[PDB]
Design an enzyme around this catalytic site. Structure first.
Site, PDB file in Angstrom:
ATOM      1  N   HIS A   1      74.535  67.016  -0.864  1.00 31.01           N
ATOM      2  CA  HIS A   1      73.168  66.412  -1.448  1.00 31.01           C
ATOM      3  C   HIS A   1      73.384  65.274  -2.254  1.00 31.01           C
ATOM      4  CE1 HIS A   1      68.943  67.106  -2.711  1.00 31.01           C
ATOM      5  NE2 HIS A   1      68.926  66.356  -1.773  1.00 31.01           N
TER       6      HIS A   1
ATOM      7  N   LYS B   1      80.056  70.641   6.995  1.00 32.52           N
ATOM      8  CA  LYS B   1      81.352  70.182   6.177  1.00 32.52           C
ATOM      9  C   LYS B   1      81.785  71.653   5.832  1.00 32.52           C
ATOM     10  CE  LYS B   1      79.204  68.299   2.877  1.00 32.52           C
ATOM     11  NZ  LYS B   1      77.548  67.976   3.461  1.00 32.52           N
ATOM     12  N   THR B   2      80.851  72.592   5.358  1.00 30.27           N
ATOM     13  CA  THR B   2      81.360  73.899   4.980  1.00 30.27           C
ATOM     14  C   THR B   2      81.799  74.630   6.061  1.00 30.27           C
ATOM     15  OG1 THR B   2      79.518  73.531   3.054  1.00 30.27           O
ATOM     16  CG2 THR B   2      80.648  75.849   3.572  1.00 30.27           C
TER      17      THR B   2
ATOM     18  N   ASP C   1      74.173  68.891   5.913  1.00 22.69           N
ATOM     19  CA  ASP C   1      73.933  69.827   7.074  1.00 22.69           C
ATOM     20  C   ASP C   1      74.783  69.254   8.213  1.00 22.69           C
ATOM     21  OD1 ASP C   1      72.495  71.915   5.981  1.00 22.69           O
ATOM     22  OD2 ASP C   1      70.937  70.818   5.651  1.00 22.69           O
TER      23      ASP C   1
HETATM   24  N1  LIG Z   1      75.312  74.970  17.423  1.00 22.61           N
HETATM   25  C1  LIG Z   1      76.195  74.508  16.425  1.00 22.61           C
HETATM   26  N2  LIG Z   1      75.806  74.022  15.118  1.00 22.61           N
HETATM   27  C2  LIG Z   1      76.838  73.694  14.179  1.00 22.61           C
HETATM   28  C3  LIG Z   1      78.224  73.575  14.711  1.00 22.61           C
HETATM   29  N3  LIG Z   1      78.934  72.972  13.507  1.00 22.61           N
HETATM   30  C4  LIG Z   1      78.136  73.112  12.540  1.00 22.61           C
HETATM   31  N4  LIG Z   1      76.799  73.644  13.020  1.00 22.61           N
HETATM   32  C5  LIG Z   1      75.951  73.631  11.927  1.00 22.61           C
HETATM   33  O1  LIG Z   1      76.051  73.294  10.813  1.00 22.61           O
HETATM   34  C6  LIG Z   1      75.676  74.140   9.882  1.00 22.61           C
HETATM   35  C7  LIG Z   1      76.348  74.541   8.598  1.00 22.61           C
HETATM   36  O2  LIG Z   1      76.700  73.194   7.903  1.00 22.61           O
HETATM   37  P1  LIG Z   1      76.275  73.163   6.113  1.00 22.61           P
HETATM   38  O3  LIG Z   1      77.441  73.747   5.765  1.00 22.61           O
HETATM   39  O4  LIG Z   1      74.756  73.523   6.195  1.00 22.61           O
HETATM   40  O5  LIG Z   1      76.371  71.505   6.371  1.00 22.61           O
HETATM   41  P2  LIG Z   1      76.834  70.942   4.793  1.00 22.61           P
HETATM   42  O6  LIG Z   1      76.284  71.962   3.731  1.00 22.61           O
HETATM   43  O7  LIG Z   1      76.330  69.687   4.664  1.00 22.61           O
HETATM   44  O8  LIG Z   1      78.448  71.219   5.056  1.00 22.61           O
HETATM   45  C8  LIG Z   1      75.112  75.478  10.523  1.00 22.61           C
HETATM   46  O9  LIG Z   1      73.821  75.679  10.114  1.00 22.61           O
HETATM   47  C9  LIG Z   1      75.061  75.306  11.907  1.00 22.61           C
HETATM   48  O10 LIG Z   1      74.154  75.691  12.612  1.00 22.61           O
HETATM   49  C10 LIG Z   1      78.531  73.639  16.041  1.00 22.61           C
HETATM   50  O11 LIG Z   1      79.761  73.337  16.568  1.00 22.61           O
HETATM   51  N5  LIG Z   1      77.480  74.101  17.061  1.00 22.61           N
HETATM   52 MG   LIG Z   2      77.050  73.495   2.351  1.00 25.08          MG
END
Ligand SMILES: Nc1nc2c(ncn2[C@@H]2O[C@H](COP(=O)(O)OP(=O)(O)O)[C@@H](O)[C@H]2O)c(=O)[nH]1
Ligand SMILES: [Mg+2]
Ligand SMILES: C/C=C\C=C\[C@@H]1O[C@](O)([C@H](CC)C(=O)NC/C=C/C=C(\C)[C@@H](OC)[C@@H](C)[C@@H]2O[C@H](/C=C/C=C/C=C(\C)C(=O)c3c(O)cc[nH]c3=O)[C@H](O)[C@@H]2O)[C@H](O)[C@H](O)C1(C)C
Ligand SMILES: [Mg+2]
Ligand SMILES: [Mg+2]
Ligand SMILES: [Mg+2]
Ligand SMILES: [Mg+2]
Ligand SMILES: [Mg+2]
Ligand SMILES: [Mg+2]
Ligand SMILES: [Mg+2]
Ligand SMILES: [Mg+2]
Ligand SMILES: [Mg+2]
Ligand SMILES: [Mg+2]
Ligand SMILES: [Mg+2]
Ligand SMILES: [Mg+2]
Ligand SMILES: [Mg+2]
Ligand SMILES: [Mg+2]
Ligand SMILES: [Mg+2]
Ligand SMILES: [Mg+2]
Ligand SMILES: [Mg+2]
Ligand SMILES: [Mg+2]
Ligand SMILES: [Mg+2]
Ligand SMILES: [Mg+2]
Ligand SMILES: [Mg+2]
Ligand SMILES: [Mg+2]
Ligand SMILES: [Mg+2]
Ligand SMILES: [Mg+2]
Ligand SMILES: [Mg+2]
Ligand SMILES: [Mg+2]
Ligand SMILES: [Mg+2]
Ligand SMILES: [Mg+2]
Ligand SMILES: [Mg+2]
Ligand SMILES: [Mg+2]
Ligand SMILES: [Mg+2]
Ligand SMILES: [Mg+2]
Ligand SMILES: [Mg+2]
Ligand SMILES: [Mg+2]
Ligand SMILES: [Mg+2]
Ligand SMILES: [Mg+2]
Ligand SMILES: [Mg+2]
Ligand SMILES: [Mg+2]
Ligand SMILES: [Mg+2]
Lengths: 371, 62, 205, 85, 82
Positions: free
Chosen positions: A62, A24-25, A21
């Site tokens: 994860h 990345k995605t 979180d």
């Molecule tokens: N407010 C805000 N949230 C962000 C930003 N960039 C990413 N996020 C948060 O990052 C999350 C998405 O990342 P995610 O794909 O879940 O992480 P990964 O699965 O570890 O790649 C979302 O819930 C967004 O709220 C940003 O520039 N501003």
């Molecule tokens: Mg993801």
RNA sequence: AAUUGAAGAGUUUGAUCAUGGCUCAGAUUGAACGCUGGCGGCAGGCCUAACACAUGCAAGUCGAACGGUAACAGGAAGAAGCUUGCUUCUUUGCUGACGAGUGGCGGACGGGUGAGUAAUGUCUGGGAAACUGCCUGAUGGAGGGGGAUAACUACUGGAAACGGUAGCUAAUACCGCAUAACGUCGCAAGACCAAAGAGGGGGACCUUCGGGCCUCUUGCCAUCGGAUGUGCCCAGAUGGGAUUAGCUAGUAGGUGGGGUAACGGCUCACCUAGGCGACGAUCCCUAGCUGGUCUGAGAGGAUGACCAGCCACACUGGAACUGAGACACGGUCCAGACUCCUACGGGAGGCAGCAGUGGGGAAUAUUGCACAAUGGGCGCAAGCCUGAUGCAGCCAUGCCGCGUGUAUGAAGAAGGCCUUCGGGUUGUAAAGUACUUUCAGCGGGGAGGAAGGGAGUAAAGUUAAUACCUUUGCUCAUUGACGUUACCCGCAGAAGAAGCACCGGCUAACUCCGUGCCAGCAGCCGCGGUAAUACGGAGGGUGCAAGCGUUAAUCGGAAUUACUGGGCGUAAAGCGCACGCAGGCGGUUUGUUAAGUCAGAUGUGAAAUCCCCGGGCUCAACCUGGGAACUGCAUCUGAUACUGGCAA
RNA sequence: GCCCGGAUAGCUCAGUCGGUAGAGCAGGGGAUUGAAAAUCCCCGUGUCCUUGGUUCGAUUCCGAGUCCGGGCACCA
């Protein structure tokens, strides 16, 4: 499968390796949404820019997936370390960086994600320096590596400032990572890392071509786990696009003819018939890792059953030590003969990682074939 | 059915899908079938030499 | 296909002389014939009716180098014919090109003839033939092509044939290796030792 | 199913239209005749038969009727209108 | 429509037609009234080449049977003066 | 010349002899599985889910039917550059042609599958109450008019799919009218019934210059034919079950009306009460049938995959329409289940076509190339179309051919195994020595499947015509997917190519060591309890060989369903006994009849397949010509002993 | 691919919430027999699924794994 994939702008692999979180995605979608605007499971997204043809692979971050991510980061050329500027270094962050060093990915670009979240020129810059140092911690260039910043969500809308910032991100991509070297010479060999079953077509193996080409219709041999089976190619693909000669260095999706879904599991290889032979016993110059290397810290002897990751999958193996040696101390350079339970195609000098206990243990290379 | 597991030793257990041919045993009443050793989840007999077309053993690689 | 094993052990098993190692030199006595089939060759077999039948059939097969299948085909071909099965089988086995070539003296042993025919040295009626199972029709003219004529082996191999009984059903030019097959061989010509009766028996069951 | 030769469908409907209409008018003149028969007006009967004969031969020639059915109508219908006349 | 036509039979790579009268709707190697001679394309020059029973053919000509192009060519090859 | 053909063995007992099962030796297969695996030839390849199916293709064609001209190519009025005829370029169906459109034809064939079907099917043989597009024979007709509409424009509905209203136009589309007979109705009198024209060339004549006229080609309408195809009818034959004995009311017949191409309860109205059934009706289960395939001395038994004929089905159920032909595989409508699309208003779908996928399963192939050949559709033809067909890929799935070397070679070696350690055996095997190169590897030549069709030319027909046209010679240019074809020649080097089963008896072939009623083997009988020819290994041997085994299946053996060809005192088996209907069988003489029976003749008995004699692939397999065979059925004329009917 | 289970002597099982593996039934050894069973005299004969870890010490606590069962995910 319809549009022919024209071979222009050198192909390059590139995937993120951040903490759970950290966006990345959102980033791996943002890059495409931006480049597809101004320029007109592991999800392999694609985006072609005037300078290069990138193949971003967004592997889930994860902890339970630190096994398939290995392979996912194996074919990768240059990772995008997307570190949130709000949390900086994190357990999974260091886990991937370390893993992205054991896999041995050459180049890496740090992207401080969600920077709009904080309004300071010292906190963000601080965690930035943090990351640059953590890169120094694992023999990465660190101070040389570029540190881009910016929001990945703002790169989703119309904020021209952040869209521009991530567009330059792509500039740092084409600049810092040069044209990759390929292996288009020696006989073709492709390690499978994902098996599909497209309706009305059949089984579809995928993965980066380790070497050689795949002219459609050529005779291929599936070699590895279980046994060995003959087959012939029938339509090579490139991100749901048609191909002629499946060259080396890029991820493809070969449609093997006359093979079932369950009879070709992840781990086998599509070697050209007569170029390789599967083996279950081999001598290898094993290099054990110490506590400063992150490997084991206690001695072991025969019976020890660690994993022997190869081209893709791992496999449990029996360790037999050469006479004149009682036990193997951590951090030593010693050869040994190994007998793994599942037969895997291999030759002399093949590089491999001996992981165990949820952590790496010792790098090695194949000394001699036995089986 | 209730097939007789031939050869010496077997990897069969609990479940494990096998393969069944005909042929009584004439010693175990109720048993009228055999298992095809070497076929499917039933591995061939270990270290056989003669008559290895049955029992599923491949030609000595050595 | 071909037996290609110890071409003299068989002669010991049949106890007689299959002329398999008829060779360039005459009589062998270089194998301990008769009383030495193998490790238990000293044994005197009880020899069941089947035993003599099978033994006979094999003797005959080992003579002409024909395998079981092709043989049984020859049998069915003999039964479907006129005359009497006994003469037939041996006439058809006699018809094989490698056999006729052998009779001509074109080659030492019969397998030698076979190896000659198979490599296009033999040419019957101007039409070069490879197959040994080629049945030589009466009034044909088997010869040896010029590009393979009098090439070392065939010469001495033909010098050998001078000591043989030599068939009256075929003739040889000897001057240019140009033989001539004629009538179908009478029964009272070939054999007079191998028993067709037992062979007819064996396939009757 | 998609097939360029679907013109047979629209054309066969455009044909059953006309052909059906003709078949109708024909059988209705025939009816007129049968009613003439039931009324017992042998004169008006003969009349209606004269009124229908050419239009049944004409439609029988056009392949609408197999000129067996036409002769059949002419046969028994005449047997009736003349059995009473 | 009755028609006289080659029936393509024999081995693979070794065609042997059997000229025959048959309904035009019939399958090539399908039902037929009667075979009338044969054609052998790969026969070359030997004891035989192409037989053709002209009497029956002539029977079917005055019967409305349309001779196919090849069979016509054969009717020519067997000639009436050569 | 054309079926010259029939084998036995083990096991019940202490032993025998019977009876009587079980089992084996054969052949076969659309086979699978295990092990092994070089090549070529010809075949075969979803037998389970008639399960659900992504994607492509599997049926179009005719400008010589028509209005057209959306593209494209040429031509022309004109146009612009500029080397003013070199280029730029707008109009123009005016030609070559050809999207969409009308019309004709085909789409009812070809291909698939075998769910349903115990007769509404099939096979055999007859039959009458029928139709039959195309093809073809004969004889006539082909006169003269009209009104529409698609396209197309204007507008407008719908997201698409897909139209709607209003105008304009053509034909070989549509429609009266004239016109008719050996056609239809009728006893006749009499009544009524059809249509279309287009293309090539052309002297005079005739031109309002649209052409009329001449001629050849083709198509059109009617009738009678022929051929073919299809519908219909009857008899015989065509699985199992009586632990299924009664079933039937359009049911059985009649009469009349309608109906069909045609007969007919095919369908109504009324009338009679019948019809089928123990020579198995109805009900139940299973099943496509046949030519044939396998087996068998034969009679038979099992089966009907490929090949060929027929029948049935086309997601499920139903219906009709178009047409010569369907009640229609890639048509229509309706409902249903199931999938997908949507702007949610509504639409789309039917792989038992070829590939292919999932699922099932012990188990079965390429999302190939081409119409070059044969055949089909259409067309004057050219050509187009064709997953039919031809090839190719794949799989030892089968049959057949060949190779994996041949000759020499005793020290009768090493190693192995055995032994009474004397030796034997593996063993002429190996190495050595001499040759050989097929087949694969490599490099060159190279058939045959190709006939045609086009252009041209001369001739004979046609004709007013040396023009077009049709036909025949004749010239050039050519048409191959297979295909880096078959086949030949050359190159190098024994060089790249042997396994599988078995060895107690049946059954060909033996010993040693390991184990000890354990582990195991086993088709049967049986082996293993510390000297196993039976287990496991080794050595050796036998069998078969690119296969060898195992399993499943059928027949044979099995005279163990006996018709050929068995039994029933005690082995399985005479009902407890009688009476007796149907059924079976029946003394003797004469007559007749000729039902069975027999003889003869004619018709048929599809082709292939089987058999025989020839021919062609280098042989073989396979292909193939002729012949015999198809044991049958039917009519016809005889015979008349025997049997049956009738008579005395 | 991932999560969650099951794996304790020949067979069936008890055994913990770290202290040095049992139960029944089988099996082996000696006596007896040709060899057994019965009878008599003696014995667990076990890699607590494999390996590593934290621990002085792990069947018993925590990782990684193989085999199996179950759930979710899996259209170039
Ligand atoms: N407010 C805000 N949230 C962000 C930003 N960039 C990413 N996020 C948060 O990052 C999350 C998405 O990342 P995610 O794909 O879940 O992480 P990964 O699965 O570890 O790649 C979302 O819930 C967004 O709220 C940003 O520039 N501003
Ligand atoms: Mg993801
Ligand atoms: C290991 C996962 C996948 C690898 C697969 C194989 O990697 C390879 O075998 C690869 C070959 C380069 C390989 O060897 N990887 C296999 C092994 C490789 C080992 C190599 C490189 C060594 O150098 C000798 C390596 C430790 C060396 O130390 C430096 C790092 C020190 C870091 C210490 C961190 C420590 C203490 C620490 O606190 C720490 C932490 O933060 C997180 C987790 N736990 C820890 O404890 C630097 O990073 C260098 O890299 C091949 O690429 C194969 O092709 C491969 C892809 C199959
Ligand atoms: Mg063979
Ligand atoms: Mg006994
Ligand atoms: Mg097409
Ligand atoms: Mg001009
Ligand atoms: Mg057009
Ligand atoms: Mg007018
Ligand atoms: Mg008209
Ligand atoms: Mg009349
Ligand atoms: Mg009536
Ligand atoms: Mg009537
Ligand atoms: Mg059925
Ligand atoms: Mg279906
Ligand atoms: Mg109609
Ligand atoms: Mg259709
Ligand atoms: Mg369809
Ligand atoms: Mg299909
Ligand atoms: Mg064609
Ligand atoms: Mg020795
Ligand atoms: Mg060659
Ligand atoms: Mg030629
Ligand atoms: Mg030619
Ligand atoms: Mg040619
Ligand atoms: Mg020509
Ligand atoms: Mg014996
Ligand atoms: Mg055995
Ligand atoms: Mg012993
Ligand atoms: Mg043994
Ligand atoms: Mg019998
Ligand atoms: Mg009896
Ligand atoms: Mg009794
Ligand atoms: Mg009594
Ligand atoms: Mg009576
Ligand atoms: Mg009497
Ligand atoms: Mg009579
Ligand atoms: Mg016949
Ligand atoms: Mg021949
Ligand atoms: Mg005859
Ligand atoms: Mg009488
Ligand atoms: Mg009498």
């Amino acid at each position: 499968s319809k549009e022919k994939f024209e071979r222009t702008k050198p192909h390059v692999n590139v995937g993120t390796i951040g903490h759970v979180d950290h966006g990345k995605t959102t980033l791996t979608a943002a890059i495409t949404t931006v480049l597809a605007k101004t320029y007109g499971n592991t999800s392999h997204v694609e985006y072609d820019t005037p300078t290069r043809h990138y193949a971003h692979v967004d592997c889930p971050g994860h902890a339970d997936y630190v096994k398939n991510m290995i392979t996912g980061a194996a074919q990768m050329d240059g990772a995008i370390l997307v570190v949130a500027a709000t949390d900086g270094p994190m357990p999974q962050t260091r886990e991937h960086i370390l893993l992205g060093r054991q896999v041995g990915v050459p180049y890496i670009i740090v992207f401080l994600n969600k920077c709009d979240m904080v309004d300071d020129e010292e906190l963000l810059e601080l965690v930035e320096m943090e990351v640059r140092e953590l890169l120094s911690q694992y023999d990465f260039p660190g101070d040389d590596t570029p540190i881009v910043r910016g929001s990945a969500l703002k790169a989703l809308e119309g904020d021209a400032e952040w869209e521009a910032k991530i567009l330059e991100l792509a500039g740092f991509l084409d600049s810092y990572i040069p044209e990759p070297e390929r292996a288009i010479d020696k006989p073709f060999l492709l390690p499978i890392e994902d098996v599909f079953s497209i309706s009305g077509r059949g089984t579809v193996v995928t993965g980066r071509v380790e070497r050689g080409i795949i002219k459609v219709g050529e005779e291929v041999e599936i070699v590895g786990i279980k046994e060995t089976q003959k087959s012939t190619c029938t339509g090579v693909e490139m991100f749901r696009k048609l191909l002629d000669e499946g060259r080396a260095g890029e991820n493809v999706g070969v449609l093997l003819r006359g093979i079932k879904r369950e009879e070709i599991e992840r781990g086998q290889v599509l070697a050209k018939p007569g170029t390789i032979k599967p083996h279950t016993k081999f001598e290898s110059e094993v290099y054990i890792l110490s506590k400063d290397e992150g490997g084991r810290h206690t001695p072991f002897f025969k019976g020890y059953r660690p994993q022997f990751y190869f081209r893709t999958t791992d496999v449990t193996g029996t360790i037999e030590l050469p006479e004149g040696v009682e036990m193997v101390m951590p951090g030593d350079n010693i050869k040994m003969v190994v007998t793994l339970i599942h037969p895997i195609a291999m030759d002399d000098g093949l590089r491999f990682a001996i992981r165990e206990g949820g952590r790496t243990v010792g790098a090695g290379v194949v000394a001699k074939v036995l089986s | 059915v209730t097939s007789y597991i031939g050869g010496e030793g077997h990897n069969l257990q609990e479940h494990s899908v096998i393969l069944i041919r005909g042929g009584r045993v004439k010693d175990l009443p109720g048993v009228r079938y055999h298992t095809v050793r070497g076929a499917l989840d039933c591995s061939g007999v270990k270290d056989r030499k003669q008559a290895r077309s049955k029992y599923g053993v491949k030609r000595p690689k050595a | 296909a071909r037996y290609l094993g110890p071409k003299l052990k068989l002669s010991r098993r049949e106890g007689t002389d299959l002329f398999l190692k008829s060779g360039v030199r005459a009589i062998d006595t270089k194998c301990k014939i008769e009383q030495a089939p193998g490790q238990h060759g000293a044994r005197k077999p009880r020899l069941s009716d089947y035993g003599v039948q099978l033994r006979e059939k094999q003797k005959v097969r080992r003579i002409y180098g024909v395998l079981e299948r092709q043989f049984r085909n020859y049998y069915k071909e003999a039964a479907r014919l006129k005359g009497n099965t006994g003469e037939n089988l041996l006439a058809l086995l006699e018809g094989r090109l490698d056999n006729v070539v052998y009779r001509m003296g074109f080659g030492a042993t019969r397998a030698e003839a076979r190896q000659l025919v198979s490599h296009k040295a033999i040419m019957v009626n101007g039409r070069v033939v490879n197959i040994a199972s080629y049945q030589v029709s009466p009034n044909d003219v088997v010869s040896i092509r010029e590009k393979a004529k009098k090439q070392s082996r065939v010469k001495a191999a033909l010098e050998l044939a001078e000591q043989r009984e030599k068939p009256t059903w075929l003739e040889v030019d000897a001057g240019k290796m140009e033989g001539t097959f004629k009538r179908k061989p009478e029964r009272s010509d070939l054999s007079a030792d191998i028993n067709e009766h037992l062979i007819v028996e064996l396939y009757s069951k | 199913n998609i097939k360029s030769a679907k013109k047979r469908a629209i054309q066969s409907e455009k044909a059953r239209k006309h052909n059906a209409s003709r078949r109708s008018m024909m059988r209705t003149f025939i009816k007129k005749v049968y009613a003439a028969i039931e009324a017992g007006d042998k004169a008006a009967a003969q009349k209606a038969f004269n009124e229908m004969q050419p239009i049944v031969d004409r439609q029988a020639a056009k392949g609408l009727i197999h000129k067996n059915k036409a002769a059949r109508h002419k046969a028994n219908l005449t047997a009736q209108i003349n059995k009473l006349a | 429509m009755v028609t006289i036509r080659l029936a393509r039979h024999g081995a693979k790579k070794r065609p042997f037609y059997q000229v025959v009268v048959a309904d035009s709707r019939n399958a090539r190697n399908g039902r037929f009234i009667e075979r009338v001679g044969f054609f052998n394309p790969i026969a070359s020059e030997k004891e035989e080449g192409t037989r053709l029973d002209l009497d029956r053919i002539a029977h079917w000509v005055g019967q409305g049977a349309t001779i196919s192009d090849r069979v016509a060519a054969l009717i020519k090859e067997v000639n009436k003066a050569a």
